Amino acid sequence: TTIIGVTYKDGVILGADSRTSTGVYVANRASDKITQLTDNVYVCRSGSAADSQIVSDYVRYFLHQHTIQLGQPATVKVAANLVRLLAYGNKDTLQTGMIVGGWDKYEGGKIYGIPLGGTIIEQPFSIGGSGSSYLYGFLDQAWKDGMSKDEAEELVKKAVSLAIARDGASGGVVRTVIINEEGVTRNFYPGDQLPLWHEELEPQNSLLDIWG
Amino acid sequence: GYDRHITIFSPEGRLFQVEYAFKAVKSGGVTSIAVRGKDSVCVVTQKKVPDKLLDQTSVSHLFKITKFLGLLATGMTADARNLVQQARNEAAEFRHKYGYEMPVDALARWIADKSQVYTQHAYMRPLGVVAIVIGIDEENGPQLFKCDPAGHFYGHKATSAGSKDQEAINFLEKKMKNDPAFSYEETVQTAISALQSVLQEDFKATEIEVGVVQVANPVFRSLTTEEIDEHLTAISER
Amino acid sequence: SRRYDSRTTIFSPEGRLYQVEYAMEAIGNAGSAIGILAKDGVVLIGEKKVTSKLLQTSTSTEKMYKIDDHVACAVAGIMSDANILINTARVQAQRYTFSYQEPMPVEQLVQSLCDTKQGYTQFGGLRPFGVSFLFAGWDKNYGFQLYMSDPSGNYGGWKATAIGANNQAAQSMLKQDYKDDVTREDAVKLALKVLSKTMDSTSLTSEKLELAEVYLLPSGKVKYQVHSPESLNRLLTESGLTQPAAETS
Amino acid sequence: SQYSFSLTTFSPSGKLVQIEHALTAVGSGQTSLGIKAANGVVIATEKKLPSILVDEASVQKIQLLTPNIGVVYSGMGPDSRVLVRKSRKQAEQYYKLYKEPIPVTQLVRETAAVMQEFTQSGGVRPFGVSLLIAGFDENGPQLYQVDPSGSYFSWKASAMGKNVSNAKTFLEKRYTDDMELDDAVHTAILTLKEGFEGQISGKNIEIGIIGTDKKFRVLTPAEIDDYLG
Amino acid sequence: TTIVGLVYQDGVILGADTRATEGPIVADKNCEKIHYMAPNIYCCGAGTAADTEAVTDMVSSQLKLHRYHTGRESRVITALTLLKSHLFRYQGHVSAALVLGGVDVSGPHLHTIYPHGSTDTLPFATMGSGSLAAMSVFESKYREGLTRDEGVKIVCEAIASGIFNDLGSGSNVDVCVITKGNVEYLRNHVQPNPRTYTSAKGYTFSKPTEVLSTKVTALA
Amino acid sequence: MECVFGLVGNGFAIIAADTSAVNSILVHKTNEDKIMKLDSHKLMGASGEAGDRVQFTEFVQKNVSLYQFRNGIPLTTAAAANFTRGELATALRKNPYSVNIILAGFDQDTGPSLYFIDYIATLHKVDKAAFGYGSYFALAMMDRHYRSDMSVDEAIKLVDECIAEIRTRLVVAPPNFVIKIVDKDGAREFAWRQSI
Amino acid sequence: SIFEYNGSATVAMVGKNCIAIGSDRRLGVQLQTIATDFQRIFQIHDRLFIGLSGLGSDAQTLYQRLVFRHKLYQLREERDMKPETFANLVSAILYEKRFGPYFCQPVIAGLGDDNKPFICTMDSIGAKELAKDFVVAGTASESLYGACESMYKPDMEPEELFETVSQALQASVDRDCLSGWGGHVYIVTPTEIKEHILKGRMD
Amino acid sequence: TGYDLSVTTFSPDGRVFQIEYAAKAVDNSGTAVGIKCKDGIVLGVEKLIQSKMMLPGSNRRIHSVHRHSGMAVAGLAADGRQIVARAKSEATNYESVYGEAVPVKELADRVASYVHLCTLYWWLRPFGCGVILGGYDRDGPQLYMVEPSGISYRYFGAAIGKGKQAAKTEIEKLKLSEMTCREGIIEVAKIIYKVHDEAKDKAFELEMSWICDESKREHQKVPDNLLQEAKAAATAALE
């Protein structure tokens, strides 16, 4: 698994990898690891599938209640703190690591990384899932604060594809979710659209097209 | 005996406390009406501030139970807020537990069932609030419903609540004898007009509040005072 | 909230509980039923109070219920509460047969039910059950037994007793006519006679009656059985013929 | 929360007064009736609404609890909903435990016990409703009645609500065994017409019928009008 | 076991074999592995049987009660969410795992539910021991917009692959076709491996089978 | 560790048991009588953890006595055995007692009976029973010489033989056994088998 | 394990309009043979029998508890419970203890409806195995499966059914050391119930 | 006539008399004024000295609820403390769960819901106190007032107790949109002094708390110097 969140001038561009595995078998190739909490806040689910899914459901429920009570678009900070309410409340049972991103008139686009165990860390970007480790070195020399929706999109695609190419637990299509003042924009990048990194070849239908 | 004081059957079979709750609704001076159209549902009531001090935006009887459900509460304001909190808790719980938006008829039925409880348990005074629920059912089209302190939810094509029940009903069914199919603008203007014909006075589009739904825009919405004023002008010139 | 409390469980200045006495009155207003403890069995007969002609009557019983393979009861009073009490009584009998693996002796079943009733009679502030039971059954301990339960939660064994409407007249005729060694047929005849003589209407109608008898089959098996309407017709005709067969002189 | 003081005590005459008030309260409810043909059952009630503006289609008085069973109420509407909900719950518990439909008699007994509960428990009033539960099952057609006292009976035909006595006598004189289901439907419609002030129409009354071995179905106005035509 | 789910152009097709085993011995040659939940929802159960029938039956009853309460036809998301809420709170101890399918106001639906409450939404799903044998066929032959006959062909091929290639599942193939209105269920659509021997002359029980006592009852 | 065994004659049901109470290696006592009297017409030999044996046996005797006085008619042997089994089986999954029980009794209308009740709460109406390491020798010898119509002389001879073998062949051979008989007259002590 | 603490062998097999249910006859601590006349088959009503293989104590408890529920059903409904319904009841009351299970492997067999046989055995937590040719449970599971698979026929008169179930049970129990010491076979027909006790190897 | 004896009993007029008796208890208490200035909120309370030996500062009636808001209670003070405690509880609980300071509007809504709930129960005495919240949110200053019946609305000025009518009339004669909280101090002091009537009641001590921008949006007492000069000005304003 891989989940990355990038903050650009206007908002967030949360990301994912799409591969729920049960051992060495790939039970699902197009899992959706980014879920909605409100129209402006999304969480990158990672870790245990059941635990992350239900924490997403419960946060969405509490956050519906909250946004009706206030009659007002719920903020990112509150979404992250609600995710922590359950991540920390259930340290024993929930083996989940998540990244929460969104947009507000109050504070703009913010990313809150709730790692395993239940801390909240506002960050310029976050990395999670088992595929994170292949990225620390790359991101540290890549992150430039204040990017556009474009450069941030390319960087998220590069990060998730580099993690995909090298990690057993991460693969499939790259999914990204651009959250902004105008609203969420969900994308889908199969392997064919992603670049080709060290010692990888261009996909070809059949060897009969080259011979050997 | 005690039956005048608590919700137990009177010697002739009436529950007097529920009746007194109805009287409490008709108290308070306010009256409200709703008109279900072909394409929309409009719900309208009158609000009035006696003081310069009281902020006018803090007083209103339209409540957004859900982005796609509304509710107009007639009765005691505190009870109206209690019932509103209960319904908001139910709507969110229904969507959570069952995975889809709660339909209007379900909200009305749940409110009515909750109200029935006060009517059977002796030491729980029935809520003195008649609540009108509007929403556009995803499959049944526009909906309108009315729940009373007794607990008799029934679905109404058009209805009234408050101190002027009968006058509003008579005007509405006079204007609706033909079983019409009201356009949006026609629906909302019929509601406003039936309020006018009950108050016997004009109103500056400020002492009135309107809430509407539309199939083209299911969100329960409260009209801008300028839209209310445009509807007033349209009523004037015909 | 205090002022709304009737204080059901409380002693009157006379030293007696009012609600239970009102319960006995409610029994007195209910349909009559009597029991005959015969040598070879026990017979319960009951009066169906509601006798509109549109009633179906295809249901086997309205006042007598089976509580176990060896015990049955005839109910008088508020049948609504009697349903609950019979449900409990069946449950208690099965609880004994589970714990000990054998039929629950009748006297114990009666006593457990009466202990249920006395609870409402003594604490909690709920109205007592307005019911009264006649129990018929058989044990290895004592053989055929007949018991009567007051809504006070009190009970006693009776060779022949009656409950419900017009109780005391039937009681008196049972005093005058019941004898030891009354067999199956004699018990049935005596019950029919005493009831009809206690009924407002002679030449009774099978649709307005119920007769049940807990006897012992030749092979030591307690067989409870409630007579079908045609069997009631046969007995009614035989009794309406035998009554003049004695009154002729 | 003591609320443990029976508000339905025994009057000095032995009568349970509050239950009697409940029986009157149903006595002032809209009429309903039911007949059992030799090969099916029929229940109907009057559904006259205070105004045309009330959408009659948004609520039904005849409701089916299990595909075999349906009920009609007279008296307070809100209480009938409580009882229908609880009876449906019990039917589904029975089906969970035994994978069979609950027999009509058992459902009636359980609903009656629910009725009785409120006539002994403290802090509550008995239900101002009486039910006609029509069902057809493995041992023939059945029509059961339930009243706020919690007692239940099996009727060949019955009625309750406004205009009980006239409908009752009408049924008693006009009922007969071997009546077919359609004859019963016509008879029920006629009985409603007897006391029904105004003129009957498919949008004024409600009818439900169980055929032979089939499911309880509530007639739609499009076809009730055909029956009454 | 081998259970399968495919969403074709009009609706969702479910499939399953009919072998049930208890260790290395087949207890039941013809098991009913596709279950009814609602007029438009069926589910193939894999994992611990007792748990699968218990949970599917409980959800079926809840869904029927909700159908009465709201009147309108139940939808699949409701079944999915009820199954999630039940399975999770038992933390996977109840080891029921299902493929769930139906057709609703929103159109065909197909989900896989795992004992911990993790769910997926998929165009093709497989579970049970032969899940790999089936997913071979799906990853080779699935495509969008299969017609009902092609879709049923593919599901039958997948189940046959999961019969012949995996020992846990065998016997006969069953299928449930869930279109908009009608659910065409097949009790034993494909019986691909008949009994190979006749046994010729039946064998005789030489030992007369001595018996000591015989109580006999004249049942009515 | 305890040894217990039973035997049903023509009109009597004998129960014998070792009378040694121990801790680890010390016979704190050799007069520990373990066969209880539930009634005038019942015996209940028990084997198992001494504390559990005593507590469970006393509990069952309490319930038997409560039934007797309340109704006026004593529990029949089969009902006493079934009640014991029910209580033991219910405790099995909640706070198990580690007692094995052999219940004998006489009822005028049924005759002598001997019930097998295991600490797992399996109940069976056995002709002959035995618990503990002496069970093997007791059962084999009874099978070898048992008949269905034994005079109390023959039954006691058989029990003496079983005791002698149990002493001779076990390593934990207890020296002292008590023999109790139930007949029409009532549960009783027959004889004490002093060895030391 | 705990299932073979006592050891049992129970079989059920379907004839034309008759049903036959068989069983072993011995109680044992593990290998001690306390009693050669144990009962694993219980009649609940004419045309319905339950065999309860597995732990003996769990078996007795479930039998007594089932009698409680069945009698109370007869008093409340006035009909003897139909086989499939009884199997569902047993499944429910076994699954209630999903996490505390009874160690029984019940076999349920009985005629009903229009004189139509019914057989099913269940997991220890109620997973039913509604079958139509035959059902087998106990420690001799595999041996019974082989014996019945090799000895069954589709539609069998009562006498053929008796002989076949008897031979299957005996030949399958002779290959098991925790079971034997006789046999106890019922042939249930819509007009007659024959309860046979068989001569077995007492070793 | 028997109907005025419980909170779960509508009188045939469809009104609950117990709530009105509670509200009367407030009407008998003492004035409490709140004002929504351009740059904050000023709360002021006429506090009556029961005996001259009380210590100036005794039984303070203006309480904080959380960092950015505070209350003034009129009516039965013992109930005012319970409501203040509940407001504190709600503020901190929301802060905990959502990680954000409670919107004063939400705080007032929760407090009002609590007050209303304390009437639905047959076994509770309805609170006999009315309160005023004046938090200074991220949505700006905003003054609320909760009535012993559970109703509440957002005001620009408020008053409760003996001096209801005079206080309201005087407030209306003020251009709240133009006065800074420094001007609000003077205005509220002057109003409280006008509305007091020495000819009827004993002396009193003005107690005022500003939730303004000088107070860094944090509810605090008015500084002693400004309060005393406002007292002197208000005294001078009586002639």
Domain boundaries, chain C: 2-248
**E200–chain G Cβ distance below 8 A for any pair:** no
What the block records as the tokens of F49 is 């953890």
Answer whether B53 sits within 8 Å of H171, measured CB to CB. yes
| Residue A7 appears among annotated catalytic residues | no
Q: What is the CATH number of the domain that holds B24?
A: 3.60.20.10
Q: Helix H segments across chain A?
A: 49-70, 76-89, 136-142, 149-166
- The span from the CA of D24 to the CA of H130, in Å, is 45
Using CB atoms, which chains have 3+ pairs under 8 A with F? C, G
What is the count of residue pairs from C and F with beta carbons less than 8 Å apart?
Answer: 23
Question: Which residue shows structure tokens 């518990």?
Answer: D93
What the block records as the tokens of B198 is 């009950």
What are the residue ranges spanned by the domains of chain H?
Answer: 1-239
Contact C17, C121 (CB under 8 A): yes
Q: Which domain holds residue E182?
A: 3-190
- The span from the CA of A136 to the CA of A139, in Å, is 5
**B25–chain H Cβ distance below 8 A for any pair:** yes
What the block records as the tokens of G30 is 């593990």
Q: Put the strands of the sheet holding C131-137 in their side by side order.
A: C64-66, C71-77, C131-137, C145-149, C155-157
What are the residue ranges spanned by the domains of chain F?
Answer: 1-196
Answer whether H10 sits within 8 Å of B53, measured CB to CB. no
Q: Give the DSSP H/E element, type plus range, for residue B193.
A: helix B184-199
Q: In a 10 Å sphere around its CB, with 0-12 CB exposed, 13-18 middle and 19+ buried, how is residue E220 labelled?
A: exposed
Question: Which residue shows structure tokens 């290998």?
Answer: G31
Contact A175, A18 (CB under 8 A): yes
- Name chain B contacts of E69, Cβ cutoff 8 Å: 106
- Name chain C contacts of G65, Cβ cutoff 8 Å: 98
* Ramachandran quadrant class, A70 (left: phi over 0; alpha: psi -120 to 50; beta: rest): alpha
- Find, among D174, D80, D96, D94, the residue nearest to D133 by Cα: D80
Answer whether G76 sits within 8 Å of D96, measured CB to CB. no
- The span from the CA of H56 to the CA of H33, in Å, is 20
Number of domain units in chain B? 1
Question: Which residue shows structure tokens 């159109």?
Answer: E107
CA distance, residue G82 to nearest chain E CA (Å): 16
| DSSP, res D56 | G
Q: Do chains C and B touch (3 or more CB pairs under 8 A)?
A: yes
Residue E98 lies in a domain: yes
Q: In a 10 Å sphere around its CB, with 0-12 CB exposed, 13-18 middle and 19+ buried, how is residue H77 labelled?
A: middle
What the block records as the tokens of F76 is 């029949």
User: Which residues touch E183 (CB under 8 Å, ≥6 apart)?
Assistant: E39, E40, E42, E176, E177
- The span from the CA of D15 to the CA of B11, in Å, is 14
Answer whether D154 sits within 8 Å of C59, measured CB to CB. yes
User: Which residues touch F76 (CB under 8 Å, ≥6 apart)?
Assistant: C102, F105, F107, F110
Q: Helix H segments across D149-214?
A: 165-174, 181-195
Q: In a 10 Å sphere around its CB, with 0-12 CB exposed, 13-18 middle and 19+ buried, how is residue A73 labelled?
A: middle
* Beta partners for residue G20, in sequence order: G13, G187
What the block records as the tokens of H190 is 């002057």
- Name chain B contacts of C1, Cβ cutoff 8 Å: 123
* Ramachandran quadrant class, C45 (left: phi over 0; alpha: psi -120 to 50; beta: rest): beta
D85: Cα separation from own chain's centroid: 14
- The span from the CA of E63 to the CA of E61, in Å, is 5
SS3 for B80-111 is HHHHHHHHHHHHHHHHHHHCCCCCHHHHHHHH
- The span from the CA of B135 to the CA of B220, in Å, is 7
What is the count of residue pairs from B and E with beta carbons less than 8 Å apart?
Answer: 24
Tell me, what amino acid is at D88? R
Contact H78, H61 (CB under 8 A): no
G86: Cα separation from own chain's centroid: 14
- The span from the CA of B62 to the CA of G106, in Å, is 62
- Name chain B contacts of D128, Cβ cutoff 8 Å: 9, 13
CA distance, residue G131 to nearest chain F CA (Å): 30
3-state secondary structure of H114: helix
G170-173, Cβ contacts within 8 angstroms, sequence gap of 24 or more:
G170/E209, G170/G198, G170/G200, G171/G143, G171/G147, G172/G9, G172/G11, G172/G140, G172/G143, G172/G144, G172/G146, G172/G147, G172/G148, G173/G9, G173/G24, G173/G140, G173/G143, G173/G200
Answer whether B64 sits within 8 Å of A64, measured CB to CB. no
Instruction: Choose among G32, G60, G100: nearest Cβ to F123.
Output: G60
What the block records as the tokens of H197 is 């009537």
- Name chain G contacts of F85, Cβ cutoff 8 Å: 57, 60
Q: Do chains F and H touch (3 or more CB pairs under 8 A)?
A: no
- The span from the CA of H170 to the CA of G82, in Å, is 86
Answer whether F118 sits within 8 Å of G57, measured CB to CB. yes
Q: D17-228 has which fold? A: Glutamine Phosphoribosylpyrophosphate, subunit 1, domain 1 (3.60.20)
User: Which residues touch C97 (CB under 8 Å, ≥6 apart)?
Assistant: C68, C103, C104, G67, G68, G71
Describe the crossing of helices D181-195 and D165-174 by its angle, rounded to 10 degrees: 150
- The span from the CA of C67 to the CA of C65, in Å, is 6
- Give me the DSSP letters along B166-191: HHHHHHHHHHTTT-----HHHHHHHH
Answer whether E218 sits within 8 Å of G192, measured CB to CB. yes
Contact A119, A91 (CB under 8 A): no
Choices 3.60.20.10, 3.90.1150.170, 3.30.450.20, 3.40.50.300: CATH for C2-248? 3.60.20.10
Instruction: Choose among F86, F89, F116: nearest Cβ to G35.
Output: F116
Residue length of chain G: 203
The CATH number of A3-209 is 3.60.20.10
- The span from the CA of C195 to the CA of C218, in Å, is 29
Contact A19, A28 (CB under 8 A): yes
**CA atoms in the 13 A half-sphere facing the CB of F34:** 33
What are the residue ranges spanned by the domains of chain A?
Answer: 3-209
- The span from the CA of G140 to the CA of G181, in Å, is 14
Phi and psi of B60, rounded to 5°?
-170, 150
Answer whether B105 sits within 8 Å of E70, measured CB to CB. yes
Tell me, what amino acid is at H124? L
Instruction: Choose among D6, D154, D168: nearest Cβ to C127.
Output: D6
* Beta partners for residue D71, in sequence order: D63, D133
Q: Which domain holds residue G137?
A: 1-203
Contact G38, G197 (CB under 8 A): no
- The span from the CA of H7 to the CA of B124, in Å, is 9
What the block records as the tokens of G97 is 């203890």
Answer whether B122 sits within 8 Å of D123, measured CB to CB. yes
Question: Which residue shows structure tokens 């790939």?
Answer: A26
Contact B63, B209 (CB under 8 A): no
* Beta partners for residue H70, in sequence order: H64
Residue E197 lies in a domain: no
User: Which residues touch G30 (CB under 8 Å, ≥6 apart)?
Assistant: G5, G178
Q: What is the CATH number of the domain that holds E91?
A: 3.60.20.10
| DSSP, res B143 | E
User: Which residues touch C35 (CB under 8 Å, ≥6 apart)?
Assistant: C42, C43, C44, C45, C74, C134, C136, C146, C148, C158, C160, C161, C162
